[PDB]
Amino acid sequence: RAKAKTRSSRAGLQFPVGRVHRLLRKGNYAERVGAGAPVYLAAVLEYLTAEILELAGNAARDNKKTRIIPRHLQLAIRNDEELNKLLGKVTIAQGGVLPNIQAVLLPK
Amino acid sequence: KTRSSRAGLQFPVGRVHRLLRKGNYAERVGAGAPVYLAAVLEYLTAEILELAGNAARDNKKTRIIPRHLQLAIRNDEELNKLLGKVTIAQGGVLPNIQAVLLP
Amino acid sequence: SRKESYSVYVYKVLKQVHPDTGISSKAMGIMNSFVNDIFERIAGEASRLAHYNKRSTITSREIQTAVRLLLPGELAKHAVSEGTKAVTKYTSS
Amino acid sequence: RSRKESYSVYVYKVLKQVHPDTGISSKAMGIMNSFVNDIFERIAGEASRLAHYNKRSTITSREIQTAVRLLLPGELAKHAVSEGTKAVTKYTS
Amino acid sequence: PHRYRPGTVALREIRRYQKSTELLIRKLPFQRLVREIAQDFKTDLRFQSSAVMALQEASEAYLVGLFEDTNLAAIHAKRVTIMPKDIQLARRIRGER
Amino acid sequence: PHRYRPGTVALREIRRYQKSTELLIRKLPFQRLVREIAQDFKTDLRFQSSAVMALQEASEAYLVGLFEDTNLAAIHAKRVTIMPKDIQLARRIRGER
Amino acid sequence: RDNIQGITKPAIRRLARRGGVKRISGLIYEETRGVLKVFLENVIRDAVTYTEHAKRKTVTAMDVVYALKRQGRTLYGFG
Amino acid sequence: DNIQGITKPAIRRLARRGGVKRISGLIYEETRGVLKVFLENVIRDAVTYTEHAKRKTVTAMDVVYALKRQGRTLYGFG
DNA sequence: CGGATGTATATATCTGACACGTGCCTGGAGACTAGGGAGTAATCCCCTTGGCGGTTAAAACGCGGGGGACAGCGCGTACGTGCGTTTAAGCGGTGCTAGAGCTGTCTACGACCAATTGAGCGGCCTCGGCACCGGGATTCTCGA
DNA sequence: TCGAGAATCCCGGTGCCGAGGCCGCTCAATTGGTCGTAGACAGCTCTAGCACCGCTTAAACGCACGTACGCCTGTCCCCCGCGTTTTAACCGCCAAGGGGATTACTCCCTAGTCTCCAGGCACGTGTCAGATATATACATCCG
């Protein structure tokens, strides 16, 4: 009997292949769920999370603070033009509005 | 014998049940769900055809043209909210002229 | 190689509502698309709602709630009344 | 008391793998969990739609690879599909 | 001859093309545009005619809606002439870009 | 008696409410308003505290977006102040009404 | 009743400032009172229906996040 | 030149369906640009669907599904 | 309103999409079962409502005033349109080959269940990142 | 420009309570097989999207001429900023109850298999509703 080896480590992923596989099983998405589909979905999820977290961390470090809070995550989502298009409909609780001011409203 | 007739409907109940089974909406579908959904679909269809017939009578034509559908769906305050985003192919536009455009 | 349609089924309703009125094939296709669209709009909403409550059955109740959600007020009332009438005619028959 | 599920010890690993000296608050953790859940729902629903549309009954890696090219805008989709292919080809071996 | 006052010809045009159900755009130029834009992503894209017709309907409808919103914005500005800034306003509030 | 020029307090106090995250509406007035509105649909209804905070924090971002669109529409008209007609225009172009 | 006016004029002022509005009219307050009422009715309608289907009498945060998700104004951080 | 096939009178009548009185001369380039953007956005999704199908043709069903994703679903093609 | 035009209105003749038998097979409807999802029952306590009282920032009121929304003149300039013409778009055939679409294998792949156990969640301290603030150095600002 | 004044940032201090690490402790994720079957593949068909030539002609295009209106001058009024007066939000802490999560036990209702039968849609006929062209009053513009 081979020793237990988790499927996330088998593919070198930080999100679980098994849990995504179970969710696709019992989520009523298809009659049968493929084998590589869960690991592919886990890879996509972990890449997206890594990107949105890296941007938020950079923005927070710019703000001289170590903790990541919804403000610095709101800035990360609304700053990059690709995540803004991906999350156009989303509202973030306790997020605030990115600092902008119109040129016409400027003094004089 | 057709459940479509024991319930006194016009749309199928068998087709709706079969689609709900292979639509993979849930593992198990209820017994009154297909008849309820068929009744709702039939009521909406009857309303739409009534409006289209009224529009056809307005245009003095015995047949209903997609333009009649467009007029009927744009001329009502409640079915517009249900079909506001959609566009009828080969249809038309509601006759609309702004007030300032008038001389 | 067969394609499912709704031509006769809309036609019966038309004849019951407006006699001596015909439908061009384009309008029949439009109505078929409309029925197939509302069917999915209701079924998918009922599926998501049933799955949101740790339930695995789509009975008349989930669709009735879906009808109440997907329609405007004065139309939702009539649609729900029609659904209850049909189901109550069916539960007794 | 009956376990709820959350991607907490799962986003901690990614954050510590990208920023070894950064921490996340509970509210931002809740935002991240809801974002990952929403992306999963969107992508899985799109793959299911493709499977139903093409008259197939199983969502293989191809369906999720196609769905990503639609859901993810911009040059993000290119990196996402590249890393998905990398992960799946390493998993096959 | 008679020279129409500017505006009356415009409304004579409006009230006759409102009833129009037609497409207003020439089929071959739009089909060529669709083929050209398709060639960028992949080559040998054989377009079915019904697909081109559906795309034409959708594009016509979208442009009609955009011009309706643009008309609304232009009338707001105490103006009766369309300007590109009114189109930018419409495409910003609609959040399309 | 130093008096700020009209607009100085507008270019200020606009920084505070943009850089920080807050609610900008008192808890209890909004709670009772929500109770009042919900009383019509169903009598004797109980709201979880989180279910009121979520409603408020999702209705703040709607008003903020509507006001941003209204401001853009007012700028279009070569003005600074925003009129109600700007608000109906914003809703109409957004397609909500 | 009469809590719609509870959303006070300074509240609309602060919201406009956060949005980026420099000068404020007089009737915009009433119009903001109207649009807020309409939006909250349109959300509470769905929230109460979702609660009623479940056969409970407490509106949870999840059953409001669902209602906002239906309208396309999805909210993160709750449920 | 393929884009300039949609010429000034065509855009004028489209605007007339929009119900307008007077149209400026700078509208044409902006309209061509926005139609170009919308058409490429729809065609990318349609071609993606066709590539999923392992086919080399774009059927009307693919176009109506691509529009369905865009939130502008179209009745009258199946 | 004198005069003039593209505005509905009544008529003949297509004529081709719409309306109607049909049949047959193909999916729906009885017949019957059984096993697992759901309704009913109890309970209990976590969470919700209701309430009193001290505290004060926020709301309301009120007035000075100043900058902007607005009323108006004009002008020339960019946009209607009348018309020739000329340019390329639908019709309508021709040819035809590449690709969608429907069947027949049968095999590699996924559901399922029987052991097996470590990863992930519930719970418990705990110390330091950040909240709050005193106050000082620092930087806009507008009346001069 | 300039200088008193009004905000503002930040340096440093104290304080805290909530991420974070650690420790049980289940049960959902791993193996190991069978077992059926979805589709991967090949092949054959047939069909329509594509190419092209000419033809008729609808309208696209360029050249003008007229002119409607998009864009500084002055005005008054309404919204901002501050000073004073509330007053209801808020925070705390209490008390009480109710209904929302839990298990436990049916139990009955829909998935599943089978056999039968009628109805729904392609496959063929007619046929008549409405397009298409022709001649007659006219609402409104030129002026």
Numbering used by the authors:
A (entry chain C): 11 to 118
B (entry chain G): 15 to 117
C (entry chain H): 32 to 124
D (entry chain D): 31 to 123
E (entry chain A), F (entry chain E): 38 to 134
G (entry chain F): 23 to 101
H (entry chain B): 24 to 101
Give the article text.
The nucleosome consists of ~147 bp of DNA wrapped around a core octameric histone protein complex, containing two copies each of histone H2A, H2B, H3, and H41. One of the most common forms of DNA damage is the baseless sugar moiety known as apurinic/apyrimidinic (AP) sites, with an estimated ~10,000 AP sites generated in each cell per day. The primary enzyme tasked with locating and processing genomic AP sites is the multifunctional nuclease AP endonuclease 1 (APE1), which is a key component of the base excision repair (BER) pathway. During BER, APE1 functions as an AP-endonuclease by cleaving the DNA phosphodiester backbone 5′ of the AP site generating a 5′-nicked BER intermediate.
The second nucleosome contains an occluded AP site near the nucleosome entry/exit site at SHL−6.5, referred to as AP-NCP−6.5. The third nucleosome contains an occluded AP site one bp adjacent to the nucleosome dyad at SHL0, referred to as AP-NCP0. The largest reduction in APE1 activity was observed for the occluded AP site near the nucleosome dyad, AP-NCP0. The APE1 cleavage rate for AP-NCP0 was 1.30×10−4 ± 0.23×10−4 s−1, which is a 3,400,000-fold reduction compared to non-nucleosomal duplex DNA. To determine any structural differences between the three AP-NCPs, we obtained two additional cryo-EM reconstructions of AP-NCP-6.5 and AP-NCP0 at 3.4 Å and 4.0 Å, respectively. In all three AP-NCP structures the AP site adopts a major conformation that is intrahelical, though we cannot rule out heterogeneity in the AP site conformation. In contrast, the damaged DNA strand containing the AP sites at SHL-6.5 and SHL0 make extensive interaction with the histone octamer. Similarly, the nucleosomal DNA surrounding the AP site at SHL0 is adjacent to the H3-H3′ interface at the nucleosome dyad. Subsequent modeling of APE1 bound at these occluded AP site positions revealed significant clashes between APE1 and the histone octamer that are incompatible with APE1 binding and DNA sculpting. Together, this indicates large-scale structural rearrangements in the nucleosomal DNA and/or histone octamer are needed for processing occluded AP sites, which explains the moderate and low APE1 cleavage rates for AP-NCP-6.5 and AP-NCP0. The AP site near the nucleosome dyad (SHL0) requires more extensive changes in nucleosome structure for efficient DNA repair.
